Amino acid sequence: NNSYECDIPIGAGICASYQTSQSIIAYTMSLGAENSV
Amino acid sequence: QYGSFCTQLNRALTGIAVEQDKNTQEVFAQVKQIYKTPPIKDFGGFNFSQILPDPSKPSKRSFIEDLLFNKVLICAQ
Amino acid sequence: IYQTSNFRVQPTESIVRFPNITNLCPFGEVFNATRFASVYAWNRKRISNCVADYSVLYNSASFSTFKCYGVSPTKLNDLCFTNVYADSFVIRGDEVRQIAPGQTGKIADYNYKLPDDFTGCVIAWNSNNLDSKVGGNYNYRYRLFRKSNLKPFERDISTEIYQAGSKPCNGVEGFNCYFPLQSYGFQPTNGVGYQPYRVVVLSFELLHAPATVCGPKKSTNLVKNKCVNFNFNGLTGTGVLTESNKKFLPFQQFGRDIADTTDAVRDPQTLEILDITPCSFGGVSVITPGTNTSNQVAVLYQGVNCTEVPNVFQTRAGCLIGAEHV
Amino acid sequence: QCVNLRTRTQLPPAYTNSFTRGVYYPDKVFRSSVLHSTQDLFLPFFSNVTWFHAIKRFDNPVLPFNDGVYFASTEKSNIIRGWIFGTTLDSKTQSLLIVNNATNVVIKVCEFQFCNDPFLGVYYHKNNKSWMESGVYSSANNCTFEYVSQPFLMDLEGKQGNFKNLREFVFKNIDGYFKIYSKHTPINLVRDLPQGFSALEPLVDLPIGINITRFQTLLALSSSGWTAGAAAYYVGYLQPRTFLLKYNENGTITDAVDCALDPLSETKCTLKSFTVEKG
Amino acid sequence: VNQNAQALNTLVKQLSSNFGAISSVLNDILSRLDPPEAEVQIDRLITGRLQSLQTYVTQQLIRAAEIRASANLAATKMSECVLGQSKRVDFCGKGYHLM
Amino acid sequence: VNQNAQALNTLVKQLSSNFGAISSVLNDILSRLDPPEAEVQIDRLITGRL
Ligand SMILES: *[C@@H]1O[C@H](CO)[C@@H](O[C@@H]2O[C@H](CO)[C@@H](O)[C@H](O)[C@H]2NC(C)=O)[C@H](O)[C@H]1NC(C)=O
Ligand SMILES: *[C@@H]1O[C@H](CO)[C@@H](O)[C@H](O)[C@H]1NC(C)=O
Ligand SMILES: *[C@@H]1O[C@H](CO)[C@@H](O)[C@H](O)[C@H]1NC(C)=O
Ligand SMILES: *[C@@H]1O[C@H](CO)[C@@H](O)[C@H](O)[C@H]1NC(C)=O
Ligand SMILES: *[C@@H]1O[C@H](CO)[C@@H](O)[C@H](O)[C@H]1NC(C)=O
Ligand SMILES: *[C@@H]1O[C@H](CO)[C@@H](O)[C@H](O)[C@H]1NC(C)=O
Ligand SMILES: *[C@@H]1O[C@H](CO)[C@@H](O)[C@H](O)[C@H]1NC(C)=O
Ligand SMILES: *[C@@H]1O[C@H](CO)[C@@H](O)[C@H](O)[C@H]1NC(C)=O
Ligand SMILES: *[C@@H]1O[C@H](CO)[C@@H](O)[C@H](O)[C@H]1NC(C)=O
Ligand SMILES: *[C@@H]1O[C@H](CO)[C@@H](O)[C@H](O)[C@H]1NC(C)=O
Ligand SMILES: *[C@@H]1O[C@H](CO)[C@@H](O)[C@H](O)[C@H]1NC(C)=O
């Protein structure tokens, strides 16, 4: 359910990476950090 | 019997080669003549001893140029 | 500058080295055989480790029909063969046109077929004088019916009774059953096309193994460092033969070693791993001033040493003649 | 002319993982320092094998033959001495007989009459270091081909702690030809199949063109009562697949990779490389 | 560099395909058949190799026409960032350009 | 201009090549041979010109 910067793009906003034991995990892309002004 | 195809092919390849030579000539040769840095350098405390040419080299490359050159069958074809 | 008329070096002589001659292939006894068996019991023979001259057979008019498919017979003596597959039988003349591959017929499908990529040569010759019997040469039999047509070059000898229906065949003959073999009617009174015909076929492969069947050899020598024409074992090429440090196993020949070209190769009659190198080539170019001004030109040979070609100044891009360095 | 044997250790067949065995030189031509992908008959990686023993324990079954066979044998004093190949084994079809005679291997292409339990009879009932072999064979009326091999001699005795004798043979019967590829190498391990990679140089090819669908092995064999050391042999079945072989500059097959086993192997076969970047 | 090498490698691998003929060596087919029916086999190889060569030339044309744009962009950047100061945002560096 | 003019000429001359056929005039081959063995000749010219 988390968000991280994309490594291996799959498509439709969903992409995967290799991370911690260690496995391949797919998730929704994160549009960078967020802040207000 | 097939006529004139190889003339077209050779013309295209020669045009490509001449275009590449023209590109290389145009990108760099932007200055009419060649300058040279004075032997003594006092640039207000700044340091440029990594990009300026180094005489102690068979070629005239600089340090960063050498580093870039390092980072990057032959006759069967 | 203009690039025209690419330059190349022409060859000088030829080398026709071949392995040692052994003896003459005994194909004559096949062609002068006493008795010929039936179609389904064809005479199959393997001929190897000898030297055969097919020019005499080709020039001989003793045969009647002679069709070579995979190769032109005229130069048949200029190819080395790994092995010879000789298949012989006797057939009715009217059906002779079943010999060719891709044909349709009774013997051509039921009990004798040929592959699509067949490269051998077929000979058919009438033998009505000696093969015909006054009472009928009925020793020759064939399969009138076959449950499944056999693949090319496989022998069927089963004596099964014909099964033309789903109902079982009982006893020696049952329902829709017939004898597997039918005799051939060969008599001296038979007309043209009904006479017996001796049919032989020769098959062989190319370059898969060091061949042993060849013809005349005329091996001369192993000269080096010359643009010569090598024809060691069928591969005809032009180039220079040098000595290489490359290593072969005791059974390795015809190295490709890059993409598709015959690289350093061994030689017959000896054991040395020779190396093949193509002759020098390059694209000559002409540099000229305005022809309105003058007429003297200069010639640049690209990327090639001009220590040999028939005020020079060899450069990195090649070498230039007709002009003097300053 | 034989005595049937039933003094066998009746056990279900054992299975072992054939890690990296069953790769050989495809063609007679030579390449070097390149990568070549080709499809042919091979033993797939990580496959079961059929295990038989020999010491009581005299495993002599009859195994079906199809698409060639891969025979491995670990032993000392090479008790196995012969192979029989055929279809009906009753003097009704051409049969192939291979016996490693004391001089060399003898090849016999004859419509030979096998019995129920034929074997290479050795009169070694009493252990007195007497290998006198006056054994005789049955009728061999119909014969077609005969061959004599090179006189290569191998050790016939020994009780070494580590099983020094290890043979790997591959038999392929296709397009009317019989290809035998052989290799021998010592191993210091007791039972486990060696881990690693080994090449396979060809040995011989024979143009025979006969039909064989069954085979059995022969070893040095009164009918009942024998004293021989432990020995094991594995039988594996081939399959048509595609392999990518990585040659070397010296002309030796360094490694091979499958093209239908695992997805990573599929990607390696696609990219024609041994290393793949993330993506 | 990898693309340029790949183009040539794929072009040179083409000299070992039947193209519908019976072999892939001109010398072999020349020395294995009579010239009355050698053209009927040579023509297929000629057509196939013409097709391959034309495809390679077209690919090279397109790639060179693409790289001309990068050459022009580099020339403009050299004429603007170096011999002066350029006020175009996010052209000569990310931020406020100096030299 | 010249380069463009270099193309059209190299097209027009293409109308004077055998292309593996027996001639280079459609009228000649049409009026010198019956159709059923004339399609097998016209097809080569069609392919080359395409
Ligand atoms: C620019 O910085 C470099 C790196 O420190 C200076 O090179 C050093 O100079 C000192 C004194 O001459 C030497 O002891 C070091 O060994 C040098 N470093 C290297 C990596 O060679 C250079 O002198 C500076 N340029 C100036 C001060 O004009
Ligand atoms: C968080 O992940 C778990 C694991 O799949 C899932 O069951 C759950 O629905 C997720 N929660 C949200 C809010 O997406
Ligand atoms: C074989 O027969 C041919 C003609 O039938 C004859 O010319 C030749 O001499 C014969 N050879 C032998 C060895 O009988
Ligand atoms: C070939 O024959 C020649 C002379 O007849 C002999 O010197 C040479 O050793 C022979 N070589 C082979 C490979 O038979
Ligand atoms: C050749 O050059 C001379 C020198 O100017 C000039 O006078 C003459 O017209 C030129 N001729 C041609 C044909 O260009
Ligand atoms: C080619 O020329 C260079 C320069 O003279 C020389 O070093 C080299 O040996 C020459 N090679 C041949 C094969 O002539
Ligand atoms: C050019 O200079 C070199 C170096 O002194 C000399 O050897 C050479 O002869 C000179 N060339 C001419 C044409 O004088
Ligand atoms: C090998 O056989 C055993 C039992 O006979 C079985 O459990 C195992 O799955 C087999 N191996 C493979 C790879 O299927
Ligand atoms: C087989 O081996 C025996 C025993 O050494 C030997 O006498 C014989 O000559 C060999 N060959 C044959 C064909 O029996
Ligand atoms: C080989 O023999 C088996 C068993 O007799 C038979 O089923 C098969 O059809 C035979 N195949 C050939 C090609 O003879
Ligand atoms: C290749 O063989 C030579 C001689 O047998 C040997 O010196 C060399 O080390 C071998 N190459 C490699 C990579 O082992």
UniProtKB/Swiss-Prot annotation, chain B:
Glycosylation sites recorded in the entry for this protein: 47
Effect after changing residue 42 to Y: In strain: 19B/501Y, Omicron/BA.1, Omicron/BA.2, Omicron/BA.2.12.1, Omicron/BA.2.75, Omicron/BA.4, Omicron/BA.5, Omicron/BQ.1.1, Omicron/XBB.1.5, Omicron/EG.5.1
Site keyed Cleavage: positions: 61-62
Task performed by this protein: Precursor of the fusion protein processed in the biosynthesis of the S protein and the formation of virus particle. Mediates fusion of the virion and cellular membranes by functioning as a class I viral fusion protein. Contains two viral fusion peptides that are unmasked after cleavage. The S2/S2' cleavage occurs during virus entry at the cell membrane by host TMPRSS2 or during endocytosis by host CSTL.
Annotated protein name in UniProt: Spike protein S2
Biological source species: Severe acute respiratory syndrome coronavirus 2
Gene behind this protein: S
Part of the intact protein present: 755 to 853 of 1273
From Swiss-Prot, chain E:
Disulfide cross-links: 81-92
Parts forming coiled coils: 1-42
Effect of substituting residue 31 to A: In strain: Alpha/B.1.1.7
Function per UniProt: Subunit of the fusion protein that is processed upon entry into the host cell. Mediates fusion of the virion and cellular membranes by functioning as a class I viral fusion protein. Contains a viral fusion peptide that is unmasked after S2 cleavage. This cleavage can occur at the cell membrane by host TMPRSS2 or during endocytosis by host CSTL. In either case, this triggers an extensive and irreversible conformational change that leads to fusion of the viral envelope with the cellular cytoplasmic membrane, releasing viral genomic RNA into the host cell cytoplasm.
The protein, known as: Spike protein S2'
Species, as recorded: Severe acute respiratory syndrome coronavirus 2
Lineage, top ranks: Viruses, Riboviria, Orthornavirae, Pisuviricota, Pisoniviricetes
Span of the entire protein shown here: 952 to 1050 of 1273
